[PDB]
């Protein structure tokens, strides 16, 4: 939830052209592109 909130705050403060998302160093290799896939996706902006 904090990552989704910070993503909205960043795109509010940066109006990004394309956002890149990485993997977490805290195993659980499923929650990496959880927040950015649908948070910074409402405006249909490319995500890598």
């Amino acid at each position: 939830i904090q990552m989704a909130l910070s993503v909205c705050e960043d795109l509010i403060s940066s109006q990004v052209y394309a956002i890149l998302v990485s993997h977490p160093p805290t195993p659980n290799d499923h929650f990496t592109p959880t927040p950015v896939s649908y948070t910074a996706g409402f405006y249909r902006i490319p995500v890598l």
């Binding site: 909205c8 509010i12 409402f42």
Partner: protein
């Protein structure tokens, strides 16, 4: 005593609010003792951060 009625109804279109609250408290379900504590909210142009 076991309420378990933490429910909430939220609208984001502000359509038929008066009829929504009018029928909200109209019938009793004592066979399912819940103490129906409910809530309400208005439209706020639902946005990711806003939501």
């Amino acid at each position: 005593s076991p309420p378990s009625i933490g429910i909430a109804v939220i609208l984001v279109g502000t359509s038929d609010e008066v009829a929504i609250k009018d029928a909200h408290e109209k019938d009793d379900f004592h066979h399912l003792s819940v103490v129906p504590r409910v809530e309400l909210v208005a439209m706020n142009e639902t946005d990711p951060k806003s939501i």
